[PDB]
Design a protein around this nucleic acid. Sequence first.
RNA 1: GCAAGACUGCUAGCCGAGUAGUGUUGGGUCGCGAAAGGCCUUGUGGUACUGCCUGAUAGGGUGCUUGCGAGUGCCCCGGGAGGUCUCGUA
RNA 2: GAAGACGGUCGAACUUGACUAUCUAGAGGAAGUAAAAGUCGUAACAAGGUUUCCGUAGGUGAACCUGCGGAAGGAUCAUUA
RNA 3: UUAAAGUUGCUGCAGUUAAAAAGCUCGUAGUUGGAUCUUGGGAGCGGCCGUCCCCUGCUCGGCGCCGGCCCGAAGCGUUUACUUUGAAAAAAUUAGAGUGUUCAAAGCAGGCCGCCUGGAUACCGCAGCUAGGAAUAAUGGAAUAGGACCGCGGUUCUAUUUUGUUGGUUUUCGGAACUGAGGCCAUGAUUAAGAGGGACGGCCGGGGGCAUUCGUAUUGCGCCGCUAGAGGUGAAAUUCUUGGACCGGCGCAAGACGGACCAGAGCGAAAGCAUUUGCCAAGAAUGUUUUCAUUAAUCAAGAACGAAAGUCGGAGGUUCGAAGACGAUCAGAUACCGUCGUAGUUCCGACCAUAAACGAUGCCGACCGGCGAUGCGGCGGCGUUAUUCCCAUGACCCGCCGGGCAGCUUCCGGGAAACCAAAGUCUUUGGGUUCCGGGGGGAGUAUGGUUGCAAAGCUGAAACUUAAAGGAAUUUGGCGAAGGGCACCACC
RNA 4: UACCCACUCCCGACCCGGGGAGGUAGUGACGAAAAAUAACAAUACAGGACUCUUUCGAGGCCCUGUAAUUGGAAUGAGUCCA
Lengths: 129, 149, 141
Amino acid sequence: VRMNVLADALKSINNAEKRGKRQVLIRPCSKVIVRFLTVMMKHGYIGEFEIIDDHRAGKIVVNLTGRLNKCGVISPRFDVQLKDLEKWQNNLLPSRQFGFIVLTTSAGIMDHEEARRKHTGGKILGFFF
Amino acid sequence: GRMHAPGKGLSQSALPYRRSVPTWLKLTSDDVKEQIYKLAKKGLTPSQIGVILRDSHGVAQVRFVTGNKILRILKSKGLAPDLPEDLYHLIKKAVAVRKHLERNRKDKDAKFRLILIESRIHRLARYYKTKRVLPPNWKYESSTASALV
Amino acid sequence: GKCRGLRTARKLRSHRRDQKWHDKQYKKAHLGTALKANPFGGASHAKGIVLEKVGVEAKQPNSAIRKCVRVQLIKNGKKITAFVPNDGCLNFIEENDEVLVAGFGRKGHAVGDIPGVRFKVVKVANVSLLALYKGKKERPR
RNA sequence: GCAAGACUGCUAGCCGAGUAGUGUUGGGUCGCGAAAGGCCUUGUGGUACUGCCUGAUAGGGUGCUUGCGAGUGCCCCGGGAGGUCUCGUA
RNA sequence: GAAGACGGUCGAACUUGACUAUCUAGAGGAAGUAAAAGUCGUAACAAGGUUUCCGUAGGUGAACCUGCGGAAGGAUCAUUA
RNA sequence: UUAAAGUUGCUGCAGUUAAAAAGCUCGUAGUUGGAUCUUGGGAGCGGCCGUCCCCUGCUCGGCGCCGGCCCGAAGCGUUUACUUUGAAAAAAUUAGAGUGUUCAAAGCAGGCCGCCUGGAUACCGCAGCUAGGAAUAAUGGAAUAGGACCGCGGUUCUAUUUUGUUGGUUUUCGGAACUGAGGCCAUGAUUAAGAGGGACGGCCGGGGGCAUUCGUAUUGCGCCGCUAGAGGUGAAAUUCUUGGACCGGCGCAAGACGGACCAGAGCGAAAGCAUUUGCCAAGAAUGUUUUCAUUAAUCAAGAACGAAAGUCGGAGGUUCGAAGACGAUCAGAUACCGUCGUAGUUCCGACCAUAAACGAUGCCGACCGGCGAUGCGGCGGCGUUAUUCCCAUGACCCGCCGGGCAGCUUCCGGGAAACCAAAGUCUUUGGGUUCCGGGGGGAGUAUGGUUGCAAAGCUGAAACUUAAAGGAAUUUGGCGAAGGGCACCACC
RNA sequence: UACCCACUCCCGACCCGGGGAGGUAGUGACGAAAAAUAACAAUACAGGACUCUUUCGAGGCCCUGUAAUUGGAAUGAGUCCA
């Protein structure tokens, strides 16, 4: 039964990137997937997406480039303090020069270096590189 | 897939995109409510009310021609039965299984399906207690056949 | 872990506790039967009295006989057998002498060529076997 | 009311007529099917091809050559006559 | 205003009796381990010379054997209208 | 005793074959939970982008003011965790700035000709307290409207600043409870998940239970004509027979089982189901513009079913047949084989819960290549047959949809390999949830508990011994395996 | 089966008494920090470094090393006025 829509959708686009497709249709639509693909497009790893609107839970179709390697997820949502950000980004990021981890905060859904420069933590949501 | 059956399945309705009444139907919403009243006075279940209202007069859905659903109108007037129709059908199926098992003792599969039906009853009764429809002291025992239908 | 919930802490703690307690190297130290079975009681060295000298058999690819001295302790009076390590050192031990029995090095296992022993001898007549073998000192009489 | 196209049923003169009679499973306008007689302009040409039965030169059950497997030929009538059809042989 | 006494309370302890946990006689039988040579036969591993194995029953010096129901971890992935 | 031990796996184990999915379902605590509620407007510091102002209000008094605005404030504007700041948080020990104990481990000393001084900080998981933020799981109102808002109209109990110095009055000033009619709002219910339950119509299946009917075959009895033989093995016998064995034919009687059709076919959770007909009760699948609206797979503790054999009371006892009794193979058969033969094999009941109960691979949900058949239901299209015409029905064919047992190829990808569309989406480890195993024996053994009339089922060790026991695969070996070729030291 | 209230403190009528609280020692390889047992010369000998004799061979002042040889400069353990 479907509970975590985010993990299934990101594993779907991960398998689409691994196989070699260019468009993929993920079935559920939440706000969190819209914000995650939003910051995904902001940080330049994938192509521009389309969201189809129905009178139900909608779908998202994404145009894929070959710049992404892995689109993981963390379940459940562990809280992350600012002293413990290096603990996660040392053993989960592949390098310090790239690889970008996202955590939801009181301000919005946003990555780790912007959370460092505005000094606000929150629970962890997912990661990519 | 199914809750008790082993296999999966995919067979359900698919309402269209348009939230609009059909243009070719001039059947007034007050009149639609009047057939809902008289077919409910005939003594049917709201699934049967919906399928006959879709069938004869050819309306897409009650929710588009009106603002409510069928059971909302029935509880607005107050002639709806207090027992839910799915619980009524499941209790009637259970007492039919009990009447079948009254004469047959070695039929183990009927007893197994009886345990499954009682499990489904106990699973749905706590939801109908939780959403505050049924009284909190209501319970389905093994002997309620002359008082409960 | 198999269960990856947010609020499932002592399910996994109980599973770790049970499968840690169901080990062998962990169960060797946390049960009193192992300490009650060892005559040393967790002691490194122990004192004992020699009552006889016995020749023991050996293993299959190396056929010989080895020299084991039978040592009776003072903790419980248990009758155990030790093993004289070096060459030509059996004649220094006779009946009714105090010796310092110790371990051997495999946590109470029969080591190598000699079956049925797990301890050796370090001192005899309050002087070490190394002194009596190398001729560092002289055995008192 | 103009106005021709696309295919099609039957009869080989037309009417009697799809009339008796037949009939399937569930139906319908219902498949099949002559004739006595009349009106008489007086009744079409090229071309194949046919073992038996149920129920068309239909469909399908099934055939013959001699040991084998397959081809050839195989409705009736009149006349000329000869004498065991081929391809390879478990 | 001392000694001493009847009552109350907290009470160490004593006698009788049951019970509980550890160590130690314990006649005797039932078992496995460490090894190089003693008799019957090779039960299983190659159609182990009776295909092997698993549950449940039954007698025997011995591995073992025989019904009943399954398995292929088997020697059959297949037997021609 | 710790790291090595990714051999305790929170990060971060394994479960087909190396140790390990309860036989399979139901189910209470606990765990995990679909989508959706607010965005933008007005202008600026600058070479369109980075800093950046607003996004609930009604009494006391204040950079100010000319009856009115703003500002300071006793009084407040439902609620958890997270996140950052702040207080309170003994010292030494941990980290760490300063200085030549000559270095250093230490110590808090010490330096310029009376003065200068430092002798700090950081950390102190949780839990408790105070604050700007509402992204994330749930809480929350209004649906029989005892729903909000400005108001209209009445009943009861009480505070003083009001009524000639004064004994005394309801008032006025105003506190609280109850309360009748109407107006006012945009008057109050988001949908219908390739989640779930239920209803509807055609149908599908050795799915169940009850009652029926049929088919040979076995054995026995009764009769008929026949002859001295049926028993079995690479080899004989124990067995029955002029008291007619054996075979053929006619009839009767009992019990068992439903061959050929009978399939990598169907149903059931699993064990398991195959002669016809009738009755009852379900259940998956396809169809839906029907109904209810997050009711959701997972399962400690609890319950139903459960091959064969095992025990207990009846009915009938045909074949087969553990034990038991003989003959031969044999040196030894108490084992293979042959002849009788007990319980059991069958039903009605009453029990126990075991298998190689095995896809040796838990359940739910999604994603990632192809191909042809098969079974159900539906969606259409040539054409043939129910004889010839017209539509739908059964059958033939073409192609599609959803679920299921499956099949062929494939470095998708994985693994120790055999192999696997899962045994993949695993160091680029994280979708959720029960059970189970850390070398091999001792041993599923001692003992304790517990169910059982009985065998046993579950839970379940310790001591002691060894460095191996094990899983996949090429090559030599030998087969009381299969299939080929060779030779006058083999045969014809 | 040690010495003393002098340093740090503590009762007590109290500058002045007491304290095996403590301090000072001796034993001590629990453990930690520093740090001796060697440096200086070359004939006796294998040439690496720079140029010629194809290669042995001269200069080799820095030489990598090493043989109970030599005149040597030095400091400590310990003995020992203070």
